[PDB]
Point group: D2
Chain length 452, copies 4
């Protein structure tokens, strides 16, 4: 990388954001003609979620939109990253549009523009329409075309007022956990060949969606991966190099959760070399036309980084420190991940990066004083943002940072047992209480991070 | 039932048969334009089959048809029950017919008619075309139409020479083990509502397939269930009634492996009442028209009976006797199952019955004398046929009995570790050796079971 | 408010803090072996070194007196003082605890000594541990050594810590050392040997100096739906219920024997092969007079008006180890135990696991721990107000330490320990607590 | 052909046939308790009654002589003769075995007594079983009691049956009594104690009458692919290989200590916490001279020229318990053992589980067992032809019986047992074997 220098710090037009996802916050899962999604069915299956929690109601954000928009303004957030519920706008996934569904996102986007908050719209954050699941979901050859139709509808109704789109959130997770480990919807444990087939169809879906998002008003399009940065043992050149190689490595026994497996097709138009020699029963035919479609020009790379892994000089994973600082969900705190992650991604692909998620699960409660004190989240945020500022100094093009999450919400298989919000939600009353971290982040934005 | 008494014994036209299934014997899994089926893929997944056995080659029946036909005639078998490989005649499951696949079954049927043996063709014995699995298989609303199209092709090409059809074999198992327990292809563990959805789509497929099989030549059409008969504690009326009720019972927590859940729809055009009360997420919509489609008139009920369970006077399950006679697969020998199973089915539905499978897994070997002695199989067959003869005497209309199997073969998740054959197969050489039970059965057929 | 002479304390256990597992002729304990068995502990952590408290006794004593703690609850490593579990006493082991107790008395801090905090000497484990008919006698000998060498200076003893856990987790579920999953009859045999062991240890501890003797249960209090009389009775009955299929973790299975001299009725009616013979003399031996009941309370469960446990509230406030925060537990637990047994209560453990770290400012901020303590202590103070006799409250723990099968992944300390340097850093909670003690809880 | 003095026998074990588990002062054993634990045994079968051989000794002896058996291998129930494992001898227990041995001698049948066939007295289990330092002494005492009451009329002794199984399955995998899953060091400790126990038992069995003393291993012979020297040597190496990750079920791990007075090399390099101290005195004690090596061989595995274990053939002939039929096992097992240890070999167990039943003709036809026996015995004959010292062959088993974790679901008998009525029906294999004995296997 070519350095930029410290002086400026964070860019003047840096998107200080917060992120949510449809299923995690919206509720009203069976209202206003919305079609079932795979998480509605998965979450209602005995044993799949922590204490059989589900997203039926969640934060009831569908009905409390106004209140949450006021929290965004109050905090002084520049950008709001959210996902559209495919099944809310297209109950069957294709064909008939649901106007009540469109109306909701319309009211959200008007509320955002009225408050001068830049919409960042995730098209797919895991809530596959159930009707499409009944037709084989991402195993179906037509799944790219289904997604394209959805993309077209998105652009049609929201292309006017929304200029930031992300096609897919974390294919590593929704394919890996959804279809390999089976812990996420729809809860399958499929063979390698089918994982490759699904990947291939998700990536082609991405291409077609990009094309659909290009028709009409100009906009910035992104793709978000789950990233677990390899943190080098030292600043020695060989150690950095080993961490870089390990970070972008993949093989037929361990690919679905990697960066390279997804980002190489998107950005370089090629899978990792190993893919070409796989001959397993039922492998998809991967063509040159496929790879051109997949690698449509996009504007930014989205990184979801929560933590990384310390590697040795040779790129092997170092044993975790005893009593290493950790979060409420069990993950370690590794501040340098928000340096090395963006750095290596910039070095490899030479693209603008947005941190589409960064946040911490904390055992938050309402204290006797009626407030929610989350110093651990503040320290986490403080530490991670310093590392991201260092990455910008060393010449990484970073255009935005999105705190996960605006609200405590339904954390997938962990239910409501993990609170990631800068805003606390009491689920008995649906009361919002802004946490200390919320005000901390507000001050950062107002000072554009100059005082970190 | 009105008895006929024990003078006549087995009817004059009784179909003495043996039974196989496509995937279990054919092999040639990747030849002659045959498309993949779910078992090709499932069996190649690590850990799914005993010692990773698969049906790639199986008994190589595809190439050794003439030797197998010769065994049939040498034994004097009246009828041969087999299944057609959907994926062999329709590689994508729909659309393009594969004429080399047709030619195989053509040469089988000609071979049979030439030897005066009556073909009993099963359409679906679990080998769903992989291409259709990728479209969601039986979860897909169109899966009935797929099957219908298959059935039409069946009728078109084989309706001339084949007069006995079975639409589905053991939906209890291919749905229950395929989609609930996940031990069989495609290896899923789906919620209750999806099992009902699959069941309903399978049953509608049956309806449509019957209609296709009715167009053109006249034939007899059946539907085969896996049945575990409840054997009453005694001949007292109340003990019998209790066994009857247990046998035909089902509920939302135990239905997929039951008789009534499948046979009530087919034969009486109604689900068990509990189904209409369920409202789980994403239950299929069951219409009056659906039930009329499902309940096309058919000519016989198929029962696959290997063993039953002894019940107390209240219909509760009695504890299995210590050291009860059992088989190599671990199942108990329960002779009375082949009396009570047919009897109760006869009483409930008043339809002709065929025993479409009965047989035993034995730890068979080639002895020093070069022969295969299976006296345990002989005794099993003798005892069960005695019981079937008694059912016929007590007024059960039984039109045939098919021994499972003609050949040792691929026994699904148990691979080649379970031999059910009246003919031994050495898989190293593909040598067939008719077992003692084969000659025993030959004698039964020639005497029409008069000497049992 | 809180009584004038209230034992404001903090608590630890030998294996969780000491380290120095293989020095000065200390014999092996079951945790030394168990912890070294791959897969038994989070990331194969072990207490070989732990907080190195063996070697940093002085520093930790200064923390105690800096916080102004009135009493220090700790356990004695049975294997450190009796390496084979019986016979030859090890004087270098005694020296350590002697040095500690001196340090405590020099700072005016009342020692509260737990005899058995789960670190069964391995040599005794090779002889069948608590399945052995002689196991009560082994303990008695250990309790006699304790009185001999420490009875002069120590007048608060706890025989056993959480029999629910070291038996239930150690021999039923198998998540704790020695990691067994034994039949019901052997669980009862173990329980009966432990309870007889307690009796004999009480008698040993009664010879010589006058002292207060206690017994500590892991208690999960049933919190009534409301203050309605019937909801309270339903909660009480649930709290003190037990049966053949769920007893090892209950209060009544252990405390009724100790305090009422009888097991729950169902225990006698069992006749599983190999069940121990429970005699009248056994029960008289078990039910020696003791001076207080120890309650380890972390959280409880809410019960409906019929005694049925309610489902945990969605998004309930919780701790870093996953447990819910249920403040009312430190009211109802003491109150119900007081009502049933009419003995003085000692809260021998109360605390919270937090995801603590050193912030950019070099301090350890644990506001959650502060709220937890504040809330729970309010409840205990209300129990006192309503006439419940509570003689002491010990915060778990003085130090972040080895949390058994969770290793070092759970920090319960009012003092943070960086395990890389063994540096102690007092958390905000430590100063909060200091202030609570100074004011005897009058500002809660 | 087969030698003139060949010991053509059949074999049983106490717990598998005797029943009468709770009578005539017999103490509990681990299998009494384990088998009553929910879900430990196939359909919760136990040996409370088994074949009721205790109460039907005459009938079973009559079958033994009817078959023309030359030797009868049985085990003595430790807990039947010493109800507490040590101390008071139970003379009603002794009487039974005295009656058995009388009935054998009376019928001209050579007794072959197994001391330990897995039924450890429960009292000793409570004292830590084979983990306890005194367990070799417990067994020594037992072996002295055996010699005292049976040394006059019994000249064939086997100290331990299948240490591979009772230690491997009993304490590593946990599928057999007592049902534990212990660390490597505790397995080696148990092995060492069993082995030392063996040594003391030999010395006890030497005091008085001269006798033949053996040690029985569970053996899985490696069958060379071909008769090539390379394939043979590779099979030999694999057959006697072991390592710290895979030793408890091997031959070398147990037989080297007994016969060569050394453990395999890898044992030197284990430094795990709790590892037993193996002294040279221990090794000399273990490695007492013995008269024969007992092999229990059911099947083997085929190894390529490299020594790598070959995959099982698709559709290989197998038994009702799932094992493959590998006739050559009863050639290479003896030969390789004979070459390594230069000791006389006794096939102390060989047979086949079959899905046997009473046919309509009222007979029990078991042609598979007949073929199995014929195929294996031909292979044993060929070993004797090639100069392997084999002193006898004992068909497992006389009766269908309690097959441990598989309960009564696996029938190994040459006599069928109907558990409803306890009727015995000699199978075709019994008669087949009778004929082989009368002809001394000349017609094989």
């Amino acid at each position: 990388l070519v350095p930029r220098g410290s002086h400026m710090g964070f860019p003047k037009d840096f998107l200080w954001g917060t992120a949510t996802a449809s299923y995690q916050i919206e509720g009203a899962a069976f209202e206003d003609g919305k079609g079932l999604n795979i998480w509605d069915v998965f979450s209602h299956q005995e044993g799949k979620i922590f204490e059989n929690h589900n997203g039926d109601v969640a934060c009831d954000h569908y009905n409390r939109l106004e209140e949450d928009l006021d929290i965004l303004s109050k905090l002084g957030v520049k950008s709001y990253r959210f996902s559209v519920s495919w099944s809310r706008v297209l109950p069957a996934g294709i064909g008939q549009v649901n106007h009540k569904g469109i109306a909701f996102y319309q009211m959200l986007i008007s509320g955002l523009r009225e408050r001068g908050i830049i919409p960042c719209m995730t098209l797919y954050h895991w809530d596959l329409p159930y009707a499409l699941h009944l037709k084989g979901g991402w195993l179906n050859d037509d799944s790219p075309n289904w997604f394209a139709e959805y993309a077209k509808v998105i652009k049609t109704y929201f292309g006017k007022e929304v200029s930031y789109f992300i096609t897919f959130n974390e294919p590593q997770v929704f394919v890996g956990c959804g279809y390999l480990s089976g812990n996420h919807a729809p809860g399958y444990q499929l063979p390698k060949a089918e994982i490759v087939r699904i990947a291939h169809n998700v990536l082609k879906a991405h291409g077609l969606a990009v094309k659909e998002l290009r028709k009409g008003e100009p906009c910035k399009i992104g793709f978000t991966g789950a990233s677990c940065p390899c943190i080098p043992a030292s600043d020695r050149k060989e150690d950095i190099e080993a961490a870089y190689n390990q970070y972008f490595s993949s093989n037929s026994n361990e690919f679905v959760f990697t960066d390279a497996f997804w980002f190489d097709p998107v950005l370089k138009g090629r899978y990792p070399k190993w893919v070409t020699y796989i001959n397993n029963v039922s492998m998809p035919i991967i063509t040159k036309e496929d790879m051109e479609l997949i690698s449509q020009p996009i504007d930014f790379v989205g990184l979801n980084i929560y933590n990384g892994k310390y590697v040795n000089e040779d790129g092997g994973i170092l044993q975790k420190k005893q009593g290493v600082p950790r979060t409420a969900i069990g993950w370690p705190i590794t501040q340098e991940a928000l340096y090395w992650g963006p750095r290596f991604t910039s070095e490899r692909y030479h693209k603008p990066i947005m941190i589409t998620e960064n946040g911490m699960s904390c055992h938050d409660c309402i204290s006797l004083d009626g407030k929610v004190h989350d110093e651990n989240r503040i320290d986490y945020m403080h530490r991670y943002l310093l590392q991201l500022k260092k990455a910008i100094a060393d010449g990484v093009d970073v255009e935005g940072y999105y705190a996960w999450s605006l609200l405590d919400n339904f954390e997938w298989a962990n239910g409501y047992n993990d609170r990631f919000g800068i805003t606390y939600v009491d689920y008995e009353t649906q009361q919002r209480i802004i946490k200390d971290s919320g005000f901390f982040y507000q001050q950062i934005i107002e000072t554009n991070g100059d005082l970190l």
